[PDB]
Amino acid sequence: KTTKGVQLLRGDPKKAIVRLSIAMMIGMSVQTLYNLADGIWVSGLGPESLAAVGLFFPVFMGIIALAAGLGVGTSSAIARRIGARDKEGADNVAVHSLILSLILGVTITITMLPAIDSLFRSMGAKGEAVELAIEYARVLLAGAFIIVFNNVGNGILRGEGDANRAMLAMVLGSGLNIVLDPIFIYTLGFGVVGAAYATLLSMVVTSLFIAYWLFVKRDTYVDITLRDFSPSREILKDILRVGLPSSLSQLSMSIAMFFLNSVAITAGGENGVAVFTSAWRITMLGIVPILGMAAATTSVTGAAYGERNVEKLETAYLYAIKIAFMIELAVVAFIMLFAPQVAYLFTYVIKGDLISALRTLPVFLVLTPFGMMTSAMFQGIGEGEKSLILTIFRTLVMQVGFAYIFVHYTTLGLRGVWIGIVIGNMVAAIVGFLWGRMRISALKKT
């Protein structure tokens, strides 16, 4: 009645942080590799194919945000029950989360399918452009349930500390999508819609593995059955108090990027937006280790909170920050030193401005862990609303705010955008860190 994952969660927090975060970073790196490769295949199909992907992209990211939001709500709620040695509670959360995956996933499909035509056209698309985007979108929308299920499955695994399988499920899915991409797009000649089917099939296979582990081998720590299922308002509210604000955090980010783009356009037009796009994509690569660490932090602080061990929660939180800080130091030094080389490789025009960008913009990555791990621990203790507030403050008030100030009130132009983004992120990192310290001392008094 105990797994390696549960032993890990109930063990030394530093050991748990390292194991989980390495596992998440590996899984997320394969997801990143898939994305880069798919970007390349699609690029060679022409403007009409890119524009079709472009039309669906906000919807698709919205679907990811909802799925991953439910996943982290699930992870946190399970980790806390396990820490509290509430086995029946952990079982019931898992069952609840799986029923929610069906409700959410299918709702996404049935709501968007009849909406996408009007949506794409309202975006300014006409005739053939509309038709191609719909062919592409409907394949992916068909798998909305699968996506949510996979994310919930991953959430359950992370919640009970099973770093190994959570990682494996990510590797299998993105790895299979990497294999199927050139075969569906070019070999079978399906073009852009081929990329959608490669993705749909990859997700289906992932779900088959997860369903096998959960329902056939039944070798997770949590027991999952409908025989023992009694609807719980408290469980539903617990999941959504982390899950909904997590999803909304992605929305805040998306809105922020829109404004950031408009500022880049104001400063540099098509040239400026191109430089920003490239510099941001490269800098977001440095974000990957932080995300893996955040996922670890949520599970580990959750378990500690359930155990009512504030010392343990604080240790995991601060150790996560320290490790992410060190990693980011190396990442930033690397990009800063090798900016011309890095630019050369991602461009194949905008070289000089991109090099400047790569030697200013990535600086904020060094302070990101202080805010992001705080957000992850807020989620671990179940207070997702605080994580959302911090996310809004960083992305919309600080990032966009300062970027706007430097461009409208100074003569820095493009460089002012990078500087504003850096300054904004760093202020938010300090505020978030201070809030986390305050929250923790409050815990010690409670």
Ligand X SMILES: CCCCCCCC/C=C\CCCCCCCC(=O)OC[C@H](O)CO
Closest CA to 377 of 390, 362, 392: 390
Over the window 187 to 226, marking each residue x when it contacts ligand X by CB under 6 A and - when it does not, the resulting string is -----------------x--xx--x---x--------xxx
Contact flag: residue 425 with ligand X (CB under 6 A): yes
Residue whose structure tokens are 């490789």: 345
Contact flag: residue 1 with ligand X (CB under 6 A): no
237-240 long-range contacts, CB within 8 A, separation 24+ = 238/73, 238/77, 238/93, 238/382, 239/70, 239/73, 239/74, 239/77, 239/93, 239/96, 239/97, 239/100, 240/73
Residues contacting ligand X: total by CB under 6 A: 68
3-state helix, strand, coil in the chain (%, to 5): 85, 0, 15
d(CA 217, CA 206): 16
Contact flag: residue 262 with ligand X (CB under 6 A): no
State the minimum distance, in angstroms, from the CB of residue 25 to ligand X: 9
For the segment 222-251, give every residue that binds ligand X (CB under 6 A): 224-226, 231-233, 236, 247, 249-251
Contact flag: residue 375 with ligand X (CB under 6 A): yes
Contact flag: residue 294 with ligand X (CB under 6 A): yes
d(CA 9, CA 306): 11
Q: Quick one: which of 6, 28, 163, 195 contacts ligand X (CB under 6 A)? A: 163
Over the window 295 to 334, marking each residue x when it contacts ligand X by CB under 6 A and - when it does not, the resulting string is ----------------------------------------
Contact flag: residue 403 with ligand X (CB under 6 A): no
Contact flag: residue 110 with ligand X (CB under 6 A): yes
Q: Quick one: which of 9, 28, 30, 133 contacts ligand X (CB under 6 A)? A: 30
d(CA 3, CA 90): 14
SS3 191: coil
Residue placing its CB nearer to ligand X in the complex, 142 or 204: 204
Q: How many CA atoms lie within 13 A of 166 on its CB side?
A: 30
Closest CA to 116 of 197, 195, 48, 55: 55
Contact flag: residue 397 with ligand X (CB under 6 A): no
d(CA 9, CA 21): 13
* Site stretch for ligand X (CB under 6 A), options 85-93, 106-114, 309-317, 412-420: 106-114
Q: How many CA atoms lie within 13 A of 332 on its CB side?
A: 18
State the minimum distance, in angstroms, from the CB of residue 298 to ligand X: 7
Q: Can you give the binding site for ligand X, defined by CB under 6 A?
A: 19, 22-23, 26, 30, 33, 37, 58-59, 61-63, 65-66, 95-96, 98-100, 102-103, 107-108, 110-112, 114-115, 118, 149, 163-164, 167-168, 171, 175, 178, 204, 207-208, 211, 215, 224-226, 231-233, 236, 247, 249-251, 253-254, 287, 291, 294, 368, 372, 375-376, 387, 391, 394-395, 399, 425
